[PDB]
Symmetry: C3
Subunit: 336 residues, 3 copies
Amino acid sequence: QDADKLPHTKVTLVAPPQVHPHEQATKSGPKVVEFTMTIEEKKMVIDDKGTTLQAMTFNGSMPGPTLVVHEGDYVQLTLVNPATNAMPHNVDFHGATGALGGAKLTNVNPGEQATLRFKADRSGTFVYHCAPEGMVPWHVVSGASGTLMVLPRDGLKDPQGKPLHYDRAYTIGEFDLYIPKGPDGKYKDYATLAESYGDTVQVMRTLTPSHIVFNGKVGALTGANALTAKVGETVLLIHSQANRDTRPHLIGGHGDWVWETGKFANPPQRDLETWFIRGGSAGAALYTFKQPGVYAYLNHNLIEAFELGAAGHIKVEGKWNDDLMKQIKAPAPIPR
Amino acid sequence: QDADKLPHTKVTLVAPPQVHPHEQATKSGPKVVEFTMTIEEKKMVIDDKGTTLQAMTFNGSMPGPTLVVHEGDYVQLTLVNPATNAMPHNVDFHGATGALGGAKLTNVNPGEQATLRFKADRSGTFVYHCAPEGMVPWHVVSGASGTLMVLPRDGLKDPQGKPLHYDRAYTIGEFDLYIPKGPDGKYKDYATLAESYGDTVQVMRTLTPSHIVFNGKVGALTGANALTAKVGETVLLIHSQANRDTRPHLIGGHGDWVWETGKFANPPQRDLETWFIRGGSAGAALYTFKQPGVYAYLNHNLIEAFELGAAGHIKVEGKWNDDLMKQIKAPAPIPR
Amino acid sequence: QDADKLPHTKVTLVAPPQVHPHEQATKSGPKVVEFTMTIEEKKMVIDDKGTTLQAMTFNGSMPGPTLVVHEGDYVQLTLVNPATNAMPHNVDFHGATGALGGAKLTNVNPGEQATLRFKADRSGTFVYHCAPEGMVPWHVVSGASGTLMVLPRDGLKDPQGKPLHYDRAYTIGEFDLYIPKGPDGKYKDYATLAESYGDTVQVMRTLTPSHIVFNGKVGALTGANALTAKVGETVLLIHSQANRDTRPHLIGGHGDWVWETGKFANPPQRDLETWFIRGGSAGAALYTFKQPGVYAYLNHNLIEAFELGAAGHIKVEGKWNDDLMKQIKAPAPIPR
Ligand SMILES: [Cu+2]
Ligand SMILES: [Cu+2]
Ligand SMILES: [Cu+2]
Ligand SMILES: [Cu+2]
Ligand SMILES: [Cu+2]
Ligand SMILES: [Cu+2]
Ligand SMILES: [Mg+2]
Ligand SMILES: [Mg+2]
Ligand SMILES: [Mg+2]
């Protein structure tokens, strides 16, 4: 399977929370799958009170888009750092072997680009992130991470080897942010990326985030921007956290089959109320919806979710099933 | 198994750390099991220096009592909010499917009551807690959570399918508390529940608890109130944490068989020194005692346990076994 | 297997990060394995800016040395507290059953020594630490912990029962330190151990460490003191944390087979990017190197690793394998 001789294809990446089209089980043999990504430095609004962040993102989103291949395929990435950026960047893929995950071979300054190829020989969801020498934590907490999903060639399996399949996949990236506050107790605003550095590092050292958000901002996946599904659909929820632990939960649901450490050759666990994604990794859960209504998907440290921002919504269409749950007596006066 | 036609029974709930009588493996078929609980708002003393908390509890205890049923049974709960309370409450069962775990169908104001029924179709220990719209974190950290244990109809099993059985079950609820301190560095005391709100939320946002207690207060399960057992007994230790991670350990023991994510259809792990309960869940461990003496059961972040309060005792009767452990030479002068 | 009749041998302990010579699978039957350790109170330099810590260590190192036996063997330890120390100490082995892990039978004051024997009947890596009544957290965070590895008599196994073997073993101890800072924002220095107490306990209660180090100091295992291996070697990485959670990761590698809860009778997980060691435990991972170069081994909360100190290096000799990873186009000007 020399690589140079296998066929090559090109994927067109989409923005979170969707994932690009792909097949679960494939008949095909190894390919070289080609992708391109641009780093974008930009100032973004992260809450509803106008707080800003001097951010660093892959393709302009938080998280960066999810890339999907099959086990045995070769990933061939072109990383582009445009001249309007001010800093150098690179990429570390946790799914790759050697060279600090690719970081040593992808150091690009503003105005440069580079291309790397690596064999994706282990299946699972894996984090990728920016990692420049001496500036690692700051480039990651500023937004630069995302997920690489490597499917087993024959699709996902339960513990006895039976096939599992999903109808839809969503990708959630969770970000712990360290926004400095001034003498007045109001969040600071910075003219450039470099100006933010000094103060940010000071908040970082306290280990206490100011905000924790899904996909870029408080409320990113709530109300009008809720994820959607229907009764009877099976959804794959991919959740990444490149720096800090989190504990996802679906209020009104469960994780039917969950790979919390995110590595598909291991058997999944079933019926979980709440699962655990270790900082520096991505995990995955399947759930088949049985009841319609609004569901909340969140980090079940409820202060982190409701005070700091780690909460989203899934709106589901269908018909109520009164056997699973039914109101016998609505709220009413106690009997006197 | 329409529900309306199955037989119905009524359980009488007891206070932690005990659990109400129940059977492990049952011959019976699905029932509708009926329970009733009252919410009680009250001011409680949480340490030995007189610190107080404006608390919200199910049935007046922290945690709320454990409810036990078998897989396939239907839980039918009556939730009662007496007129002496000041706020509205509800309940979210993580063992239920739909309607935000039951929260949408149980919103009761002071002086009202409501009844919900749901099918318990997944086995394991599951957290339940209060969850009112816009006030979630505060009602949970104030004390309102507990555990629902759903046993598999044929009892608990080891990984090769062999039967496991316990002689006694205890339930431990761990609570992270955020009690405000004043200019003097002394804990504040509040006349009403509502008066405490503003300051509490400020301590919460720091993510640093003032106290972490088992079952309501520092020393709740120590010295005279230790849990009890005897050499040769097999105990089931149920441990819940509705908001924050913890890591239980038995000094001088192990977890023989442990379900850390708390879901009985998965195989347990064996011989654990320390296990991990994710915030927003309940887990379970079995241990058979082999040596008499005092054992400490605690959160093995030792600052959390010894400085903040997360430590209890188990006193065990029986005969010392010198093969497992023996003192060869007692403490004595080094040889000169 | 009365103990008094089995053969007895004596092991000679070495300093971290190495582990003393031992066999994986053994033909032998139960022995009484004898070890001796001295507690040493000493002031040590923990970073590169001269910060000091008033430390308490087993045999003068952080962590204490790893002790290795086989399942069914009896551990016989002599603990020695020299007259130049100021405090009393003891030891709690998480691998032992009864007497608070041995703590009640090993209380030695300066100038005394004691000998304990316990049966090592459960396999896995287990933490040991000092635990004196009323002073537990402080003696542990000051440096007094290490690992006891109990191998299964027939060596380590994969999940289908196939044999796994390693060529080299390293031991990493991770320590969260709470060094007080003064009005000037400079770290305090203390003349004696007892003088440090009062202030340390105050930093501890904030739950926010000032430093988190591998093996004693920032940079202990970096650059010139990197761990070493070669392409084709299989290494066993043992990682202990007696007080706080951590999440290890090998940049450019994976955990081929990992026991995160560290208990060898359970099947390992494979292909992990990042794993989780619960505070109060030790875990183990195997990895076979496939590419030469420098690898970083660290806690993947990247603030904890790069700002606070939890990062080390592994330098590996061998020949680059261009199929796993290859640079297609080096960094260069974007095309105009
Ligand atoms: Cu960058
Ligand atoms: Cu990384
Ligand atoms: Cu409430
Ligand atoms: Cu919940
Ligand atoms: Cu000590
Ligand atoms: Cu311990
Ligand atoms: Mg994980
Ligand atoms: Mg859990
Ligand atoms: Mg562990």
